[PDB]
Design a protein around this ligand. Sequence first.
Ligand SMILES: [C-]#N
Ligand SMILES: [Cl-]
Length: 342
Amino acid sequence: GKWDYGEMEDFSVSASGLFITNEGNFQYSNATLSYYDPATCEVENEVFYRANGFKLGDVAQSMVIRDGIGWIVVNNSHVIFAIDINTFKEVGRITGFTSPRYIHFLSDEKAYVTQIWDYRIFIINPKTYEITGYIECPDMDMESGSTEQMVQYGKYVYVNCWSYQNRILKIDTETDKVVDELTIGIQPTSLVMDKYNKMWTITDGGYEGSPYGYEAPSLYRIDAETFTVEKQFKFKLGDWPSEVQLNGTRDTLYWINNDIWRMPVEADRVPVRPFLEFRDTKYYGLTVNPNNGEVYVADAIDYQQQGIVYRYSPQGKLIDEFYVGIIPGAFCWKLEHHHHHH
Ligand SMILES: [C-]#N
Ligand SMILES: [Cl-]
C-alpha cells in the first residue's frame, strides 16, 4: 500500500490538523507526507503524491507553515516544496540546495535554509522561489559541514551544527554573518528556546567507529543572553539521543533517549521516570500540541516497516495511535489561529 492511487485526488481537509513528514529509507526515494485530523482521529497517508501525482523524493526532513503555505524540506532531493495546506497541491518549489535541513523565516522575502555537506547556510527569497545568498560558517568545509535547527533571540539566530560538528553558532540577521560560537559535546541534534530565554540542545554522542568522535551524550541548558552553558546533563555512552521539543508555553521540555523524557524547564534534575517508556522499538520524532499539550511520538519501529505515531495526553495517557509512512521523523502543526508565545 503505497502508490496505486490512480488519478490525483482533490483534498479539502480540516482547518486544524497535523502534518507528519516521513523520511523514508535514505537513497530509496520513498519519503511521504501524512496528515492527521485530531478531531476525527483519522490519518491520510501519501497525501503529497495523491494530490500532485508525483513523489516527494528522498528524506523529507522537516516542514514549516507560514501564511497558508507549507514548506517541506526534502533533504536528499535538493528541493523545498511549497504546498497549499488545505489541498496539498504544489504552489512552488526551490531547487539547487546541497542537502537542505530546516527553514527559518525572517520575512516574506527572506529565510535561512540549513544544510548538511556544506559550510554555508542558504538565504532564500520565498516570495520569488530563489536562492539569494549564503552565510559562510567558520571552520567548516563541504566534506563534513553541517548546520541544523534554528531559534531566534532578538536580532540573532542561533543554529546547532550537527553531523561531525560540536558547536552552536550565533548569526546577526542584520548582516547575515556568524558573529559568535559555543563549543559543546559532539553532534548537538536540535535546538529550542524556553520562556526564560534559555536554549536547550541535546547531543547524539556520535557513533562507534566515527572519525570524529563517540562519547557520552548530554542535554544542555544554555543562557541565550550570555551564550554560556548553565548546566550539562550527561547521559551514558551508547545512548543516541535526539529531538528536544517544548510545549506551547515553552515551560516543559521533552526529548528522545530510548524512552521519551520530560522535565520542567526550571527543574534541577531529570525525573527518574520517563514520560513514555522504551518498548524495544525506535522512537524517532516528537512534537507537543502548542494549544493543549498533547504529546505525539513518532516511532520508526525498525526503520523498515510502516511507522506509527502515538498521541498521549499531557498526563501520559494514550489517546490514539495511527500508522503513517516509513521513518516518520518530524511534525508541523496546522492551527486555525496562529499560535505564538512569550
Ligand atoms: C543518522 N543519524
Ligand atoms: Cl506523499
